Symmetry: D2
């Protein structure tokens, strides 16, 4: 028969095998992990605050006529501050999609600015990668701004920016203003203020969240580690646990703090994963901070501030292997470069919820592309290098392009977060680097036992996915160009020091 | 029905789509491309010459009792010059296999030296990646040397090398001597001399090679670009074309040079792909070099030396897109970082010939692992986070490990070139970065028409490969934690400026 | 006959020759250039607000009993976040002085943490260089913090930090909190607020400033470019120009803005020198911005915000050759990388004021050092490689050490900004690199005409400074047989 | 009374103080340290073999009519592979001299290719620094090649190279061929063979060398560490010590090897200073190697091959403090990074021999420069910012230029190794960084006792060298109101 699998929308997907039996400590980011912001309301709120900010610093009034359009941005686009393009690139820096403003640039014209349809993604001065869910409003705003200055006649388009009279406004300078304004929106607190004053509008709520976290604390420790301050965190978490019952209905409600062994605010991630700041214990009954740990009876509170990830693991008595860290952010090679053991990782990708719907509900699109590809192979079926034939594939290519575009638009104007045609995005490549497990939401762990063995799927290369495990009887001897015309004792047991 | 495909051992595998109709110029490396060296005779010859070299520079006589063992090395291993281990690592620097000498290190012991089972593959001072087919003898020799100094009592093992009396011999110093000696073997010409004096023993020969190259020159230009000098190249190529007939049997034999539009020796790759050296035209009737091009009638020869890849394309009148460059070496991002258009690429991986046999002839091994994995899923079938069950998977894991090791050993002691268990190797990752097409040999193009459209296979992520394109009817509403509780005009035609 | 030179405290010192005749545009930083903050009051103010910020985020109450000690910090020290040391290093990263808290570490134990008495300044993650005048309070605070936790009973000293029970607190973490608090004090305007509310206490005022700027404005253009906003710039600049007469005798007062052809606020240096931000005009009467220029009557206003160094140079019609940029900050070589000719530079270095006093008023210490060296050469005068004599030099070496340390202490506990003994500091090396001219203040341009040819002094090497041009067989090993 | 100093051509110059008393181990490079190659014969030999190598790989026959011109190259020039220029730059990458072939480029057109007269030396791919004595022939050859193709009819000059018809030949490509040919000439032993077959022509000989090394061997240990193999080392060292008497009068000759406690050949510097290669013993009578040490009687031999600097220091029982390493090569800061104390350094700089002759025998040129500067200060003596006077200085500036250029030409067409005008070269800066002591030859240690206290000379800044220690209200803008 076939392998049993849970329903698609409940699945946890496995990049690297993970024995959940061994997880003794579950760690959480808050933003977009426990506190999932409603889409597109929250993106559109960030957009407005940023636009409003730029206008009050001198950007034109026409900006206030921009409306956030959730169908345009995809996450992980690269902004080329030299030519002002949003780029969807693959794992190796090859261009997949190129948008100047809202104008999508065809392949040939792309080669003027990118002669090899390639970017050096390491040129951090030039290219800015919009990876986060917070980057989404900004991704759209950059396109809005490029489009407006392009089409407004008060400004003359040039290769690397706009002339306003005798003044040059480079794309890199505009981007600096957008970047400054997004920070300001977040770090002066205007967005949190608006968020907190209407939580029903802006934050998702779900009773399964206290349920799942209560089960996690039955088998291990549970901790929160957030860059937000305690005041914001308390307001958010109280809302998330505000039900007329506790974990199971008919049970007594209990405060959100009772679900955690350790609560860490003001984390200053990503610095948190280095040496961080000095750890201070927070006295929530007072609000007073004190570096270190309380010596007195106040030591039984669990709210902390600053610190480092290494320190938090000490407080929990949790070795790195024991920890599954659940969040929405792809971190670099910071944690594993350490002499200390790192955390295993569950990556929240909320966009996966819509993408799985495209995958399941648009089958007729996938079927047709498979059809067209099977027909194409039939047209070349018995041809080899002696054949002069040039089969007519013109129309079938045109229907391939037309079906593929239709699929793309099922995701949005910028296509799927994970691929374009046959090529994985840079983002997809980073998901595979960073995440041991991933899902639309951490809540999918509800549907798995804590003894579950998560087994990784082989990611197949072209010669594995298009060759069957069947014996191929060849009548001609294999060319010795291919075969090359083909003592330590062999190891007696498995040599895999990874176990995946 | 199913998609028609050529027989497995004739296939060209596609990472990135390529319209072969547009290829107007075919370029070749010589070594391990046109001139395929017999295995393991040629590896074993390189081994002996290197060992002999080290002995005459003071290394112990016991080295001459080493015999090359083709079942041990896999290509792409990393040599850690700090701890003297051969490492098989994945695309992200995670350890898969760790061999100190001929001792394979289990996972737990690995963590002493690699606390995160991770290496920073960028630490080029410490880690040396043995990617080439020429590296194979050296890969085995490094293991031989570590094993000998470990087990010989005249030397005391330490973490980073050996004590010989009061003298410390670091692994990094030993590696420097091995590296120096391999160079010497190649650059004083001892290996070419031995090769040339017994070409039947050392070089593969195949009549399909003149056939395929004659067909290529029917539709485009053909050129050779080799680091070897003309003298070696002539000896090799004359042997490769030495048949009592030409392209087709019953035709007149013709000299190998008649198969090329341009013959480039002394290329100094990889510098060749930068600014290179000054181009000089070679006068083979004389041997005299002259920088530039001959003004007189000698300008009708086609042998050149030095130069750059940009210059060679000018001579051919070949824009970069028009060129398919066929060879065995994975190059870095050198060619695409240029403002000039780069070559498309066909990668020769000779090991693919044995790997495809494992894939097809050891099906019963693959079937069992699929069985065991289907049984494992059955054991967790109706469990979720409320379940207390801990199903007994002990024996079925043991049979997984035992079957997986058996598969590994079908490839060699160091396993497949492309994966370990569920993880692709670093090498596999580089194949996907660099090669538009790849095969065990370029001769497989014989079985494809020159109008062929090579269409890339999707490389599927876990949520694509383990979810069907079937409509999933859910009775419970999807958690808004996953859905988030979900103007420019949309593009009307495909936006893919890559076309793959 | 000897060369004429202006009086020492009026001099502009010349590192690279500069023909003032060609300067047609004069550009100023404001902070510590036009607005010289009184020392040590201002450092002490920044120190106190930073300590209070730290205590308010949970640092111990004892910190509030630290008093800023201006005799301790010398600018340009390197804080080693690994071992908690303030370090004075030379141009090449050789150790000269090593302080742990307030304990000064001798040579031999220095070698335990620094085996070659060498740091790699490239290690930006480990070593933080405290080069600015704003960094002076933070330099002392770091020393205070390391001293406090080293001698506090509640804590256990370690190599890389301290234990508070079973909890480790790294110097790197602690330095991050000090770093964050100094930013916080500055970017909250706490410091700006206390400054503005008492300008006499914190800001130097001097009628020579309006005189010098009006003379520059007569020979060319003058521009201001500060990171500060307009409201703080206005308060400060209004104070600096608040005199009952204009710059000439019996002339009437005129506003500070009229001394400038272009006023740029919110500069966002150092980004300002690359692509910066988009330039916007400032309506001073309203305080509102508009990117570009106001399309109306307000186009005639001369106050802008943000922008870039290149936009401002084009706005003034000045090529890089025309411009002398006057300021207190040393910038990296990332403005010479541009493809248009960059500015020439005048580095304001306030410490030069007290350093020159030491140079001239402690001449007895220099003379004694010279005698001890002369006397020392006399001891070796008759010896070559054939000599077994080991002259007894310990007592004279003892006296050299005492005298050099006496000199060091005339500058402060960390010695001179520019050197320790025979070795130039890293800071001195960066002045040589960046500053075409330098003085203790820009005001010393008063004493020079705008046609002056500033001529660079040779920096002599040992084989130049210790052999005379006087005319005196030589080994072919030295001659290569020429 | 003035300070006693040894005669100028006998001096060891002191950059960092060094107590020779503490040196217990003396270590030598051989090439250009013990074996000083005669100039210009040796440079000319290397030049000719390199030209012939190039012509034999297809470069035009005209090259064989180049003659090495020793008056052109100064060591330490930077070859710009993009534009074909030899460049003399200062410590910070500022342009001082720019030669294209043999055409010297004035300031203003320099700015077309170098808008800030600045190069980024970090661009290792673009700029190649020609610092070694071995690099002198290649420095001139580069200039010859650029001059040849610029004025050859068959070629078309471009910005970054030349066209040979429809074919482009970049300076970068051409530089690669010169680079490869210089390696080829050296690593084929062509140069070593012609040297050994005529040692009188190419190698300086001097009986003072065996005297100095035997005196070192009496106070401590002496070691040799050369990249050369043993056969070439033996030929050369045998020649250098070939005298009818030993070092003392009427003493008998003894072999060169007996002057060394350890002879290391095949050093593979600079890798030698990291982990190097495995150390092997050399059986001199046989020429065979054995890694480690011979387990027999040959263990008493003192000739090794390969190894590392750390292995050799442990072999001698010398910590880094004990060692003075004597050599002609400037190394990067990648030996101070080690976790054991590194060597102290003596940099042999042959050009110092002729440079000191210029310093003392062209004093009239220095005096005139001094008068012109004094006279120039007198012209400005009475002017300050109120002055409109623009004194006429063109004729005196003209004479300064002529005189400075006259001085430059005493060193050679590229001027002094250490400076151009008021600006130290990049090379001078690297001597300051790397060399604790330096002289024109190691032989000047003869004139100093092994108990000598080498004392460093202050390198004065402009505000130190041009204001007297003599005692002379000051603006609070300079004083910060102290």
């Amino acid at each position: 028969l076939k392998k049993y699998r849970r329903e698609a929308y409940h699945r946890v997907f496995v990049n690297r095998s993970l024995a959940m039996e061994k997880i003794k400590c579950f760690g959480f980011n808050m933003d977009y992990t426990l506190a999932v912001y409603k889409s597109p309301e929250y993106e559109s709120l960030g957009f407005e605050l940023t636009v409003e900010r730029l206008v009050s610093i001198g950007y034109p009034q026409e900006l206030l006529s921009f409306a956030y359009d959730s169908t345009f941005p995809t996450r992980g686009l690269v902004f080329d501050t030299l030519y002002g393009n949003l780029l969807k690139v693959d794992a190796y820096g090859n261009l997949l999609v190129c948008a100047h403003g809202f104008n999508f640039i065809r392949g040939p014209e792309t080669r003027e600015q990118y002669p090899n349809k390639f970017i050096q993604r390491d040129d951090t001065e030039r290219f800015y990668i919009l990876n986060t869910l917070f980057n989404l409003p900004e991704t759209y705003l950059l396109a809005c701004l490029v489009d407006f200055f392009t089409n407004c006649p008060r400004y003359t388009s040039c290769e690397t920016g706009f002339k306003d009279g005798d003044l040059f406004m480079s794309y890199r300078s505009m981007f600096q203003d957008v970047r400054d304004a997004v920070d300001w929106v977040h770090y002066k607190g205007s967005l949190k203020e608006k968020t907190v004053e209407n939580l029903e509008k802006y934050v998702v709520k779900d009773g399964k969240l206290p349920l799942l976290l209560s089960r996690m604390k039955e088998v291990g420790k549970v901790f929160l580690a957030t860059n937000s301050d305690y005041k914001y965190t308390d307001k958010i978490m109280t809302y998330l646990f505000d039900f007329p019952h506790g974990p199971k209905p008919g049970s007594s409600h209990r405060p959100w703090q009772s679900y955690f062994d350790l609560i860490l605010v003001d984390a200053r991630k990503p610095l948190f994963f280095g040496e961080g700041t000095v750890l201070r214990q927070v006295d929530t009954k007072t609000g007073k901070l004190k570096i270190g740990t309380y010596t007195g009876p106040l030591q039984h509170g669990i709210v902390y501030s600053g610190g480092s990830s290494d320190t938090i693991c000490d407080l929990l008595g949790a070795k790195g292997k024991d920890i599954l860290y659940i969040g929405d952010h792809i971190f670099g090679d910071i944690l594993k470069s350490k002499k200390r053991q790192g955390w295993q990782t569950f990556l929240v990708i909320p966009e996966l919820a819509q993408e799985l719907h495209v995958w399941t509900d648009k089958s007729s699109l996938f079927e047709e592309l498979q059809s067209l590809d099977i027909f194409l192979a039939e047209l070349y079926k018995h041809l080899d290098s002696s054949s002069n034939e040039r089969p007519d594939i013109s129309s079938i290519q045109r229907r391939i392009k037309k079906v593929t575009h239709d699929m793309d638009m099922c995701y949005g104007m910028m296509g799927s977060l994970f691929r374009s045609g046959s090529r994985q995005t840079l983002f997809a490549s980073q998901v595979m680097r960073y995440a041991d497990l991933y899902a639309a939401s951490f809540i999918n762990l509800l549907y798995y036992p804590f003894s579950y063995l998560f087994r990784a799927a082989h990611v197949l290369m072209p010669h594995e996915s298009t060759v069957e495990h069947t014996h191929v009887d060849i009548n001609e001897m294999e060319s010795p160009l291919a075969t090359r015309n083909r003592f330590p004792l062999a190891p007696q047991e498995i040599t895999h020091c990874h176990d995946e």
